[PDB]
Amino acid sequence: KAIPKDQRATTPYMTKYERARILGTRALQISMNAPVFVDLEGETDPLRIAMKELAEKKIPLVIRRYLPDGSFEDWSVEELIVD
Amino acid sequence: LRMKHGTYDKLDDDGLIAPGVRVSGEDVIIGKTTPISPDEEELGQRTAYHSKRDASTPLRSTENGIVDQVLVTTNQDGLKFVKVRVRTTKIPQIGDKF
Amino acid sequence: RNGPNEHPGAKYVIRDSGDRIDLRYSKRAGDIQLQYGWKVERHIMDNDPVLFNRQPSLHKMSMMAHRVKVIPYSTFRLNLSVTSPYNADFDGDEMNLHVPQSEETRAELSQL
Amino acid sequence: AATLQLGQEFQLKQINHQGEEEELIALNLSEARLVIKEALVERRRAFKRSQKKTREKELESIDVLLEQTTGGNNKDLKNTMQYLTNFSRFRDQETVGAVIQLLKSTGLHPFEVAQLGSLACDTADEAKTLIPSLNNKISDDELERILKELSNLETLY
Amino acid sequence: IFVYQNNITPSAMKLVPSIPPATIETFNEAALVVNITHHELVPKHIRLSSDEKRELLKRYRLKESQLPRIQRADPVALYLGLKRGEVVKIIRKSETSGRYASYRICM
Amino acid sequence: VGVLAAQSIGEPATQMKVTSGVPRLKEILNVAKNMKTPSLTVY
Amino acid sequence: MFFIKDLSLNITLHPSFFGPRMKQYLKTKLLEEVEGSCTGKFGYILCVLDYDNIDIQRGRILPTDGSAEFNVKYRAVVFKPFKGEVVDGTVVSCSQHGFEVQVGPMKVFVTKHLMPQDLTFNAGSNPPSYQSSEDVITIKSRIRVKIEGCISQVSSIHAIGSIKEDYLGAI
Amino acid sequence: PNLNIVLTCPECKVYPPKIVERFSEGDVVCALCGLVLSDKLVDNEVQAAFAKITMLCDAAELPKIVKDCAKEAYKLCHDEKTLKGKSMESIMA
Amino acid sequence: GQQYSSAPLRTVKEVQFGLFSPEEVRAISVAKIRFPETMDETQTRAKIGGLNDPRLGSIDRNLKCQTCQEGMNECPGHFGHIDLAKPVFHVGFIAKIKKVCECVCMHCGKLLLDEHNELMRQALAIKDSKKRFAAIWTLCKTKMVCETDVPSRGGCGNTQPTIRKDGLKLVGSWKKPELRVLSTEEILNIFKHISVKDFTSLGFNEVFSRPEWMILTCLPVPPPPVRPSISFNESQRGEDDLTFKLADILKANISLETLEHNGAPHHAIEEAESLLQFHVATYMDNDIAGQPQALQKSGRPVKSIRARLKGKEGRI
Amino acid sequence: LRFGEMERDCMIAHGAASFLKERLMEASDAFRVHICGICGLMTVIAKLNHNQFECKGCDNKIDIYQIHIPYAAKLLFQELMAMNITPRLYTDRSRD
Amino acid sequence: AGRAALYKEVYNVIASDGSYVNYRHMALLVDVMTTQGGLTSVTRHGFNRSNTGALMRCSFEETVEILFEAGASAELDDCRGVSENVILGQMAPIGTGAFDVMIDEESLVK
Amino acid sequence: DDIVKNLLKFVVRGFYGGSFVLVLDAILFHSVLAEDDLKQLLSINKTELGPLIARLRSDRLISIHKQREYPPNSKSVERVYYYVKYPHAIDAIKWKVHQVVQRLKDGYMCPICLTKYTQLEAVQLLNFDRTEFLCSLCDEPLVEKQDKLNRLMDQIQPIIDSLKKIDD
């Protein structure tokens, strides 16, 4: 039931599975034209553009991590340390 | 009706491909037809077509070659039927095995 | 405009209405112009990732993404370092390829 | 049907989005016209706020408002407002204000009190026939005494 | 605790659960000849206090059923005289972690 | 992980006088009540 | 019966709508779909109260199509017709089986068999009217109708009533 | 009662259907605008009589076509009035 | 490509299993399916009440399936029912029925033994359903006499017989020896008398699962989508083995109806029943051990539903 | 080409769910059915150009849910039903 | 002791073949064979007879019997199992899909 | 047993023809018969007695005990005992009469579609363009006692009065 931030016990690193999914999802949205938050270098491929955002943490998503009890944490993809 | 979309141009009137004709996949070697009862189906345009459902044995989709030989013969019980023999050169290729 | 027969081309179009137009027979009508949100089905082109598999497939290694390089003739070509995890040797062996159809999935393959 | 047994959502017991319990809200149509006409007024402001950076005369004044606030794709509301307007017993909320008070005293069920103010009744039997659940709960005269008062408080058309 | 030499009449065994809460553990002499726990393969066991337990379950967010289960007839279980719903801890010396705690619950 | 272990074990099985090898492994997984060559090692 | 109720609804944004102003888009789709629509459960949805305080909750993204789903809790006014209910209405269409009563957004039909014996249909009038021993039922004429039965369909509602009994008929 | 399905192009509408069907792609397409119409195209007395008849034609070594023409014939006659007899030997012959 | 629907889209989470209340069957089913014929007398269209009528879903892409309309693509297919003249056993549960009987009384329909017994008291504490049924059945199979009075209780001191499965039948054995095959109805009656406490004390759920439902008083008919026709040469009609089985179960049923209706030797009845039971049995399971298999006219064994699910390349 | 049990398991071993789902739905077969919210059965009669629905016998014209399943799983159910087993389905968690 | 001994038994047939498998995997296997409190075979008998969801059980070995006993006992299936979610064709609670992705308004404004 | 015999005669008048009534009266004349006694007593055959026996078995009208005469001369003796059970007959007649009264106490169809509609379907089928009830799929036109049941009920009322007299 949405453990509060002070009590969030999980790994602040972004598991590869997460990074994979967020990439896919964001890239999909981008392909569907949802606004892009980073100035392109001339990029075209959405998946590239997605990674380009992920580097700068401009991706505006939030991960809901279900614990086995049924509860969850919500980490913002911007606060998760990556790599 | 129900006619296949391979080209029939090669067929001689009898419904066979005279040998020596170069054929390719989806071509129709043997033009065979069946009668249909008008009331039986009336599916799609069958009422307008009035007549004969198309059953023709095509050449294999992927093959091609030259018809070597065609023979016609009545079998044991008297039905006219035909065999067709299509020769093709298969040249050694990258995928081929030895 | 390149049509289905030339390689860099598209087989079908899907309008935002969710209706597929076959590009064969489209030329007879003579013109098609795309609008954002339409989905065009294009031939595989260089760098599209694809799963690739050699059965019985008893390793998680036995199914791996790959980055397509279109080349002529018939067999799938692949480097020989990768022959061991598939438990593969090149005599009559065959390998099933699988194209993901969704941008999401396409990403997952490259990233996992 | 009306035994005063309604749907699950239409059950007398309600709860708000804050999680607090509430009694069901039923409406005779006087204020029912007004509240709808009410909200559209503030709704019109919010449209112009973000834009910066007789009873016959009522029908057309609403329709124009229906062309502004509402996209115009709603016929039902256009049908509803007219329905509300023509059959409204009480024109002014000021009048309705006492009506909402008067009608609810004994604590009659929401469905009951709604039909009372939304319909014209004279005799107790008239009401209690149209609303069968009022038979044994309230005396005939106590009802009519209100029914008399209601017809008196009716806004002159 | 009652140690017997060879065997006991079934009637006597039946009369054993006759004094709750008190219980009677019954061991064979020939069975106790060697303590099992001294054996190499048996890692140290610890019985737990209910308070400690409720802490355990709360911290891992578990139902009793969800714990790895141990059976009453287990020689170790008999040895410590466990009862149902009582949690034991096990410290096994791991060749990866080097000290690995574990938790089980009598059936 | 569960799969990854299952594969990880079953694969070296594919590449396979005390009973040994695959047939031994079969005994183990089956938890055979009775096995071919029971044995002890006493110190 | 005109009531008010707290209602929930789920909404789907196409990705292109995710700009910061999106909440406004939410309130837009909410009004567009909800107001004027019907739902078999809660009846005809009329107007949405409390426009400003609408709760957005927390938007979840679903699998493929990448479209954001939401759950909106709002308070609104809706009309739910009921069986054994007395209502007033103005005729619109006239059939030999009966005249169709317009009550609010809802069109109620009354069967001729549900009508008194003295009440008779007249096709010799323009438009066709019902001429009883006393009252004459025409389009613009007002009639008090007690609703006998209701049919509730997801997204629609239709129903029947009878003026046969006492305290009923033309207004 | 109705139940007959016809395939028509809502964008063309000019004619009734004039289409081609693609078996490999398992889809059916209007030949004009090149629109796909459909997808996922899927790929006691008597028995006694025919028994003894079967035996007879068999002993006679007549090819199955003849046998089956006679079967068909006999079914048409069957129980009809005008036959009015013949004991089942005459009819079989 | 399927047509739009305004229904709310959700994903399955919980999945609950049970048995069909024959009442609910009838509530669901759209036809009685009286006539064993397949197509119409005209030889086109459908028998309209035969095994396949437009009420059930329709194939061929040109037929709109009267009840749903829509297509063959859209139509889920719909269920028919058949009213069994005489009740029959669902094969899969023949075993568990046998145990159930052995567990309970055969007259007053009460659990043998009782709560008063200590062993029973112990077993009832078990939370696992299956284990509870097993443990209890160890006790109740042994005691062969229901008893009117017990020291610290139901009546009917009748001696509970031994039940032995023999050839798709159950045979009672009384030492009192009295040997009687056990008819369906009497058994069903017993199950009807089982108290809620009783069967819920066994592995059954009062809502979804009743021994009454384990016995078949009526039967569902799958739409053709389960059992489609196939065409050979595309000019010859091919019928599915399930369709042939429905034709058999029907014909057998109609026979048993008529024989029951009039002219009953009661040796013919008991046979005609055993025929019905057999057809329905091999319909659900062809491969039951010791019984004769149902052979399609070609000599091949019929492929029963169970065969469709069972092996590799089965549906699962 | 056949994408089998083992092949699946390799996917699970990579932990890529989306791909698996796609490859077992869009890539092969996907089917859309309506189910009652009382009886979990597929009984629902959906007649729509009219947006009309009834599950007869639980008498629900109101609450019906839309789902997608592989066409085969559909068969698996209808088979069970034809075998007199009810595989009721529910989109909410009653056990909680 | 049964556990550790078991690991030792397994570990032998691997080192016998000369192959090497990480300690983890064998450990995981053993522990699964154990937690029931007695040695649970890997057979139609041993694990398949546990209480896990019907679909998951019926897929492995005896499908008709498992389904009949399920419907007999009115067994509930939560569908947290992998194979179950597969049969139903919905995204499994594993890997990529073990968690769920949401949009936040807060960071989106900034 | 005169009242029971009169009720049985009334049931014979209501249910079936006169031959069944005569067979019941013949059983009433003679105390007990075994499976062959009606045949000796009646000019009807045993196979036809069998259709009538199946008709009696369909209802609760009478009762059968199945008994063997044990003495071992050849195959012994199949004797059937037909004895009327009054309670089952009383219960079945009451259920039938009450059900009949319920049936007495208790519409749109398209010619080409052969469908069927009801009042709730009437609200759905109404069209504003024309004035008519239109079919759903085919859009075809729609088309489509108690006092007589009450008079036949007057016959039922004498039977109910006879049942009340039999009860008390």
Ligand SMILES: [Mg+2]
């Ligand atoms: Mg090789």
Ligand SMILES: [Zn+2]
């Ligand atoms: Zn076209």
Ligand SMILES: [Zn+2]
């Ligand atoms: Zn249908």
Ligand SMILES: [Zn+2]
């Ligand atoms: Zn008893």
Ligand SMILES: [Zn+2]
């Ligand atoms: Zn339902």
